[PDB]
């Protein structure tokens, strides 16, 4: 069970990212979670700023909710218990942002 240290991206974005964190009706902020034992160290996580979305007036519309959008990703976690160092894979759920939804 050997993992090649080599990695490559055919996925270079070549588009424009956008500062929609605060322009969203369901705004959120980012947090850089850091673990020296996993790769990559830094994984950015977002949390919803409010419980409800935000109207055009700026007031919080309680009637519709601010909710998290999650993404599955892999990180390699290294365990070192003992003299031996050994790392396995790990599915972690990064919260990417928030969207506005009608409750049911």
């Amino acid at each position: 069970m050997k993992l090649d240290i080599g990695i490559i991206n055919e996925n270079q974005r070549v588009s424009m990212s956008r500062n929609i964190e605060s322009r969203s009706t369901s705004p959120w902020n980012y947090t850089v979670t850091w673990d020296p034992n996993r790769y990559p160290s830094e994984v950015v996580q977002a949390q919803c700023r409010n419980l409800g979305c935000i109207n055009a007036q700026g007031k919080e519309d309680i009637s519709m909710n601010s909710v998290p959008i999650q993404q599955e990703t892999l990180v390699v976690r290294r365990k070192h218990q003992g003299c031996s160092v050994s790392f396995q894979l790990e599915k972690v759920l990064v919260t990417v942002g928030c969207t506005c939804v009608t409750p049911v």
Partner: protein, 271 residues
């Protein structure tokens, strides 16, 4: 997040020989960790510079200078790995410094810079420069992060950068709204050098109120290369209503970069 050129780069300096070796953010020090690690960097600092490619185009480049902490563990340092992390998209971009020659003294300050990371215009990034080898499991950090914020495409010198020229703040449409005939308005504005459509959104509100009596949208087909940069004129018939005096006409472009999210321009008339 990318490095404008694939040109080779210099990190050597009077007293030090090293070279810059592209690196996934994984290191042979993170796995197979060496016994004696170096001390964190100090005085990490990130400014905003703009560099040209070999072609004409120029991008905002992140300029990372940090210096080396002054203590005994310098002997054992053997490089530094830089990591730029874009918060939005969880995109990390690493390079890595590698010292061919070790250094045994601190006689004067060991300063390092690296400004070859191209950066997006409204973006916030977290640059962080680990020192190599990396800490053994359960050891001291030895790195140093610092949040970095790139100003929007209204920055005096930013707006003139390629990524802001495309979908550019350089395109201003002199916007003309003439009251004209009652119940009729003629809008003119100049247009960009991209054959992508536009949209005028005329909404009229009761004066002193944010409800709209009348709202009309007008599609404008994608300009032919000959029509680029020449004002376009649209006459729209307004609602025959009293108190429906206040008029907001905004123009939304759909340039390839940013398609749909482009900024819009609202001119408003009051009676």
């Amino acid at each position: 997040l990318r490095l404008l050129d694939h040109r080779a780069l210099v990190c050597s300096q009077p007293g030090l020989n090293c070279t810059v070796k592209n690196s996934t953010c994984l290191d042979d020090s993170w796995i197979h960790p060496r016994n004696l690690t170096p001390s964190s960097p100090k005085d990490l600092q990130i400014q905003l510079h703009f560099a040209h490619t070999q072609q004409g185009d120029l991008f905002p480049v992140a300029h990372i200078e940090w210096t080396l902490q002054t203590d005994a563990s310098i002997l054992y340092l053997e490089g530094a790995e830089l990591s730029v992390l874009q918060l939005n998209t969880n995109e990390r971009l690493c390079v890595r410094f590698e010292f061919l020659s070790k250094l045994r003294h601190h006689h004067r300050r060991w300063r390092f810079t690296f400004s070859h990371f191209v950066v997006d215009p409204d973006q916030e990034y977290e640059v962080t420069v680990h020192h190599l080898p990396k800490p053994i499991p359960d050891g001291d950090p030895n790195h140093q992060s610092k949040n970095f914020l790139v100003p929007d495409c209204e920055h005096a010198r930013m707006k003139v950068t390629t990524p802001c020229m495309s979908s550019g703040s350089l395109w201003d449409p002199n916007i003309t709204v003439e009251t004209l005939e009652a119940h009729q308005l003629r809008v003119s504005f100049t247009l960009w050098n991209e054959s992508t459509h536009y949209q005028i959104l005329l909404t009229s509100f009761p004066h002193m109120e944010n409800h709209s009596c009348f709202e009309h949208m007008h599609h404008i087909p994608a300009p032919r290369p000959e029509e680029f940069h020449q004002r376009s004129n649209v006459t729209l018939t307004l609602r025959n209503l009293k108190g429906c005096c206040r008029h907001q006409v905004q123009i939304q472009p759909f340039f390839s970069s940013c398609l749909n999210d482009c900024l819009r321009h609202s001119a408003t008339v009051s009676c």
